[PDB]
Amino acid sequence: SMVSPEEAVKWGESFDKLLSHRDGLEAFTRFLKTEFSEENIEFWIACEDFKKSKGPQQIHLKAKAIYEKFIQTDAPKEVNLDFHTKEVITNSITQPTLHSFDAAQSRVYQLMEQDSYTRFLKSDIYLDLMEGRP
Q1: Which of 8, 13, 42, 70 is the most exposed place for a label (fewest CB within 10 A)?
Q2: Cα(122)–Cα(25) distance, rounded to whole angstroms?
Q3: Which part of the chain is the RGS domain?
Q4: CA-to-CA distance for 82 and 3, rounded, in angstroms?
Q5: Does domain 6-35+116-134 sit in CATH 1.10.196.10?
């Protein structure tokens, strides 16, 4: 999508700016698809959708869904969330708060950074946005 090199270099400092920019989100998800790591980004995105809820009982229903389907070490998805964190969650899932998975959000978010975002910055994709030199 329409992005200028300036916007691109700004994506190289502000991860949220990359995400919030429709063009950036597009580029990042398409790249992230090659390694199927989109699971992680959409994981805590789903946690924000959970955080968007306002139904107390629904909080438990949603949290239980996210629990068995994502939070678990096995799960049909199996999220790359930190062990110690998901351990505390598997226990704290009895009475989840609106931001119960705020820890999970923080973990996975900065995990994609140090893992996927680094290679993203040195990928031919981002270097193409730079048009500098191979």
Answers
A1: 13
A2: 17
A3: 14-130
A4: 34
A5: yes
